[PDB]
Paper text:
The most aggregation-prone segment comprises residues 85–124 (named Nup98FG85). All four fibril types display a parallel in-register β-structure comprising short and kinked β-strands.
To gain insight into the molecular organization of cohesive FG-repeat interactions, Nup98FG85 was allowed to aggregate in pure water. EM revealed the formation of well-defined and mostly separated amyloid fibrils. In all four Nup98FG85 fibril structures, side chains stacked along the fibril axes build glutamine and asparagine ladders (top).
Author numbering:
A (entry chain K), B (entry chain I), C (entry chain G), D (entry chain E), E (entry chain C), F (entry chain A), ...: 85 to 121
L (entry chain B), M (entry chain D), N (entry chain F), O (entry chain H), P (entry chain J), Q (entry chain L), ...: 85 to 109
Write the structure that this text describes.
């Protein structure tokens, strides 16, 4: 499987089975810059 | 499988089976810049 | 499979089977800039 | 499969089978700029 | 398959089989600019 | 298949089989600008 | 499986079975720069 | 399995079974720089 | 299993069974630099 | 199992069974530099 | 099992059974440099 | 199966969406 | 199965989405 | 099964999403 | 099973998400 | 099973997420 | 089982997340 | 089982996370 | 079992995390 | 069992973590 | 069993961690 | 059993950790 790439939060490469992944984010003025390629 | 690329939140490359992925985001004035290519 | 690219939220490349992906976003004045190509 | 590109929300490249993807967005004055090409 | 490109919401390139994709958007004065080409 | 391009909502390039795609939008004064070509 | 790469949060390469992964993030003005490639 | 790489938080390579991984982050003005490749 | 690499927090290579891993981080202006490759 | 590598916090290579691992970090202006490869 | 490598905190190679490992860190301006490879 | 109940006050822009799929193999 | 109840006040922009899928193998 | 109850005050932008999936093997 | 109750004050941007999955093997 | 109760004051950006999974082997 | 109660003051950005999993072997 | 109670003052960025897992062998 | 009570003052960035696991062999 | 009580003053970055595990053999 | 009480003053970066494990053989 | 009481002054970086394990053979 391919690489899992994240800045904030989680990067999950393993297979997930009956298994919950969750993330609650509360941001006051976030700024995100992505240069994907 | 291809690379999973994320700035905030989760990048999941593994196969997910009976398995919940969730993310609750509450942003006050987010700004997102993406240069996809 | 191709690369999954996201700025906020989730990038999921694995095959998902009986498995729920959800994201609740509540933004006050978001601004999104995308340059897709 | 092709690349999945998203700014906010989810980019899903894997095949999804019996599997729900959902996103609830509540925006106060969002602004979106897209330059697709 | 071709690239899935979205600013807000979801970009889904994988084949979807018995599988629901939904997005509820509630915007107060959204503004969208698209330059498609 | 061709690229799926969307600003708000979903861009779906994969073949969809027995599978529901839905989006509920409630906008107070949206403004949309499209320059398609 | 591929490498799991994260800046803040968790990088999970092992297969996860009946097992919950969660992350609660509360950011005041985060700034994220990603150069993915 | 692949290497688990994280700056803050946890890098988990072992298989996780009935086992919870969680991280609560509260950041005042975080800045993240990632050069993934 | 692959190497678990972390700067702050925990690097866990062993299989975890009925066993909880948690980390509470409270940062005032963190700065993270990652050069992943 | 692979090597567990950490700068601050814990590096755990043994299998963990019914056993809790936790770390509470409170940083005033941390700076993290990682060169992962 | 692999070597457990840590600078501050604990390096645990033995299997841990019903046994809690915890570390409370309170840093004023920590600086971490990691060259993992 | 599922019963969605939605109330909107006066002068309020609103949508209701309901999707049900029954699969019987 | 699931009953979603949503109330919106007056002059309030709102959406309700309900999805149910029943799978019987 | 699950009952989501959501109240929105007046002049408030809001969404409710409900997803249920029943699997019977 | 699970009952989510969410209140939003006036003039407040809000979302509710509910997901339930029942698996019966 | 689980009852999440969330209150948001006026003029406050907010999300509620609820996930339940029932597994019956 | 678990009851999460969360209060947010006015003008406050907030999220609630609830996850329950029931396993019955 | 577990009851998490969280209060946030006005103008305060906040998250609540609740996870419960019940295992019945 | 466990009751976590967390108070945050005004203008304060905050998280609450609750995890419970019940194992019944 | 365990009751964690945490107070944060105004303008203070804070986290609360609670973990409970019950094992019944 | 154990009651942790933690107070943080204003403008103070803080964490609370609570872990309880009950083993009943 | 054990009651940890921790006070932090203003502008002070702080952690509280509590661990309890009950073993009943």
């Amino acid at each position: 499987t391919g690489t899992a790439n994240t800045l904030f939060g989680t990067a999950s490469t393993g297979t997930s089975l009956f298994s919950s992944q969750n993330n609650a984010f509360a941001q006051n003025k976030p700024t995100g810059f992505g240069n994907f390629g």
